[PDB]
Amino acid sequence: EQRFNNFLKALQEKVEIKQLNHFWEIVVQDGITLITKEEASGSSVTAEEAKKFGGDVDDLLDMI
Amino acid sequence: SLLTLLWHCSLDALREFFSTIVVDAIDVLKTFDTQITKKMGYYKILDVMYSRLPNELTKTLIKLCYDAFTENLERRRLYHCA
16 A cells, blocks of 8 residues: 555656646546555545646747 | 947937848848958947847847857957957
8 A cells, every 4th residue: 555655656746747738637637536645544645635636048038 | 430429429310220220230240351340340330329228139139149259360359359
């Protein structure tokens, strides 16, 4: 339970750092079930509510 | 000649003269002596008038001269300075 708890938290973070056009928004919208750690209660369920809810200057100085 | 008058030019006349010479300088910004001397003049006339007052086109123009310094005969260093 806890092994996959930390695994799933790490994977949620990893997909979060993956900016996509089909990113974890689709995962989360169906991840209303379970996307965080769950061992028995407490910091488990709380975790749910924690996550369930020069050329550059040319870019920055010619069109910002 | 030109630097003195540009330093003492009336700011209002500066505006319409700038509007007149915008494209005339932009196009020309892009033996060997003729071009580099003309660009000498262009830099030394535009700088003083930028020193007066502040669209979007200008945002490009600056870098059109930035590389003009970063090249890797003394007229070349004078060009970089201008």
